[PDB]
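Closing statement on the beta-D-glucopyranose sub-project.
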Amino acid sequence: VDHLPIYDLDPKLEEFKDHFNYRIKRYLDQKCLIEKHEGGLEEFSKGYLKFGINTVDGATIYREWAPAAQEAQLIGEFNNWNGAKHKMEKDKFGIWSIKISHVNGKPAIPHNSKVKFRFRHGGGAWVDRIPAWIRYATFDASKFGAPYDGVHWDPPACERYVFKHPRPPKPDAPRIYEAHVGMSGEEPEVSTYREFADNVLPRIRANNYNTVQLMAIMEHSYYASFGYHVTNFFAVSSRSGTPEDLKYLVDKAHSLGLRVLMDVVHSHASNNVTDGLNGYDVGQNTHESYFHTGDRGYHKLWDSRLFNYANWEVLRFLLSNLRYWMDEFMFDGFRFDGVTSMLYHHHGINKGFTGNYKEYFSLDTDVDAIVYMMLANHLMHKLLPEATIVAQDVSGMPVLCRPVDEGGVGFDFRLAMAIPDRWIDYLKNKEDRKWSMSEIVQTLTNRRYTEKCIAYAESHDQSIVGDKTIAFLLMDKEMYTGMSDLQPASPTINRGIALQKMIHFITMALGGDGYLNFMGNEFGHPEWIDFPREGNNWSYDKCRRQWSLVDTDHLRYKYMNAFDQAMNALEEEFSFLSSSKQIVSDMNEKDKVIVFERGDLVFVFNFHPNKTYKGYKVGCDLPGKYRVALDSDALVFGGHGRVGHDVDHFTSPEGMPGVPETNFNNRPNSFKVLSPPRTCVAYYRVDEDREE
Ligand SMILES: OC[C@H]1O[C@H](O[C@H]2[C@H](O)[C@@H](O)[C@@H](O[C@H]3[C@H](O)[C@@H](O)[C@@H](O[C@H]4[C@H](O)[C@@H](O)[C@@H](O[C@H]5[C@H](O)[C@@H](O)[C@@H](O)O[C@@H]5CO)O[C@@H]4CO)O[C@@H]3CO)O[C@@H]2CO)[C@H](O)[C@@H](O)[C@@H]1O
Ligand SMILES: OC[C@H]1O[C@@H](O)[C@H](O)[C@@H](O)[C@@H]1O
Ligand SMILES: OC[C@H]1O[C@@H](O)[C@H](O)[C@@H](O)[C@@H]1O
C-alpha cells in the first residue's frame, strides 16, 4: 500500500517501513492540521507579524504566549517601567495580548527603546522577561556579566535598510567560506557587521568562494559559545551591530555574487534564565512550555534547554524564525546546527555509529524533532526554491538529505564531519612515511552517493575542541619567523606550505559535492582560536584574524591564498564538485602517490618527502592531449616551477572500452607525467577539434 521513493535509492531502508510509515503519518497529520487551522505552512510561519511587538492600523499590538502567568503587563522606558496602565489579557490558548494606540500620531513605544514582559506566576513578586520574539537585545559591554535589555526595533523609514541587490542564482556546487563576524577583524576586539561586509566579503569573493556560512547571528549571551547557545532567537547578535547592519552585510554579499547562509540553532536554547527563552519555564507542564521538563528537558547537556517540538506554539516559533531570517535579511538558506542532538533522544553522545541501520531507526529516533525539520524543509524550499539547507550531523543518518516528498528529512547537504580527524591524527601521530594512501582515500570517499555532502579539511569544529590549525600542526612556532619571502624558506616551512595545499585540494576534489573553508585557513593562518576567558586574562589576541599576514608581500602566506584562489577558480571552470564521475585508479603505497578522476580532470598527488617520479603512467578516460590544469609547484603558489604548464601529454590505448582485464588500472587510456615530491597536479584534455 505504501512505497517511498527513498526505498529505490537504498534497499536496506524498507526493513524499517514501520518506522517511516509512522514518521510520515506524523508529518502529514501535523501539516494537515496546520493547513486546516493556520492557513498552511507559509501562513503559519508569518508568526513574527503577530507575536512580539507589531504596528497595525494606527495602533501597536504586543502578543506573548505565556499560559503559566496569571497576570501580565508590558513594561518599558515608554511607561517608566510601570505597567499598571498596560495590563495584558489572556486568551483561551494562554496567549497574552494588548493594543496600544498611537500617542501624538506616533507609535507609543519609541523605536530603539527598552521593554520587558512582566508577569506573576502565583500572587508573588513580578517576574520580568525579554519578549521571546524580540528582534534586538543590548548589553553594557563595559560591565562583566551584564544582563541584556530587550529593545523594540522598528526604525523610521530613513533608517531602514533598503535591499539594492538580488539573490544570486543557486551555484552548481557550494564553495563555502565559513565565518564569524566578531572575530573577523585584525584588531583585538569584537568586530562589526559593517567592517566584515566592507573588508572581508571582498576577500571571500576575490578567492572565488560562492557562499558565506555566517555563524553566530542569533543572539547569544556567551560570546565563547561561538553562537551555539541562543538566548533571543529573533535577535541579531548586538555585539557586532544592529539588524540593519546585518541587512547591509547580506546585500553587499549579493552584490559581489555571494550567497549567504545563516547558522540556525534549533537544537536547543541556552539555559540562561535571566536573558533567554529558558526564563519562560516557571515549572508548568511541557504542553504550556517551550521545553520538556525533568530529564527530558536537558539530558545533562551543558547550557541547554531542549524543545518540545510537538508543541503547536513551538512549531509556530521555530518555523516563523526561519521565515523571519529569510524574508527580513534575504538569506539564501541555512545550516541547522546540532542535528545529531535533534535526531536522537541520546543525542548521539557516546555513540558509536558502526553502520547498523538499527542505530538510526529505533525508539531512540526523535520523531517530534524530525517532523519539525521536515516541516521546516518543506517550508523553506517553498519560500525559496533555490535555497540551500545544510545539516550539521556527525551520525550520517540515511535520507537526511533527500527531499521531504521522497520521504527524506529535506536537507540539501550534510557536512563531511569525519574528514578533519583523519588529517589531525595523521599530523599528530603518523610520520610522513607511515601515511596510508588507501586510508586517506577511504576517509574522503566513504560517504553516501545518493546524498550530497560538503567537505572540508578543517573548520570551526576543531577550534571549539581547542585543536590547532592544519598549518600550525605542520609548521608550529617556526611560522612567526620563517615566513619571509625575502630569504629562502627552511625545509620544514617548504614542507608545510606544500602539504597545506595538497590537503585542502584532495579534500576538495575527492571529499564531496561541496567545499567549506573557515576564515583565515585559506592562507594557512597560524596560531589558533581562543576566546577571552579568565585563563587567558580576557585576551582577544587569539580572537581575531591577522589579515596583515596575507596582505604583506614579503611573506609567504600569499602563496597559500593564491593557491586557494586558483583552486576555487579551477572548480568554477571545470565544475568537478557537481560531477558524479569519481574514479580512484591508483593508490601507490610504496611511492606515496594517489591518482584519481573527478569530472573531466585527472589528479596526481605525490605525498612522498623527496622522490621525483618521471614518466609516471596515469589512467584516464578519453584519449587525446593533456595539459596542466592546476599545479601546486607553480612559482605563484610558492613552488619550485619544476612542472611545465605548456607541455603536451599524449594518450596511449590500453586494451578496449569496458574490459577490466586489458585496461590500465581499470582505465581505457593512459598518459605520462612528471611528479616532484609533495606536489598535486590536475590535468585537463585539450579540446580538439575546437580551434582549429
Ligand atoms: O475549532 C474551534 C476553534 O477555532 C479557533 O481556534 C484555532 C486557533 O485559531 C488556531 O491557532 C489553532 O489553535 C492552536 C493554538 O493557536 C495553539 O496555541 C495551541 O493551543 C494550545 C496552547 O498553546 C496551550 O497553551 C494550551 O492552552 C490551554 C489549554 O487548552 C487548556 O486546557 C488549559 O489547560 O489552559 C491552557 C493554557 O491557557 O493548549 C492549547 C490547545 O492544545 O494549539 C492549538 C491547536 O490545538 O487551532 C484552533 C482550532 O482550529 C478559534 O480561535 C477558537 O475560538 C475556536 O474555539
Ligand atoms: O513514538 C513511538 C513510535 O516511535 C517510532 O520511532 C517507532 O518507529 C514506532 O514504531 C513507534 O510507534
Ligand atoms: O526588572 C526590570 C528593571 O529594568 C531595569 O532596566 C530598570 O533599572 C528597573 O526599573 C526595572 O526594575
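The first helix runs from residue 5 to 9. With this model delivered, the sub-project is considered complete and its resources will be redirected to Aim 3.
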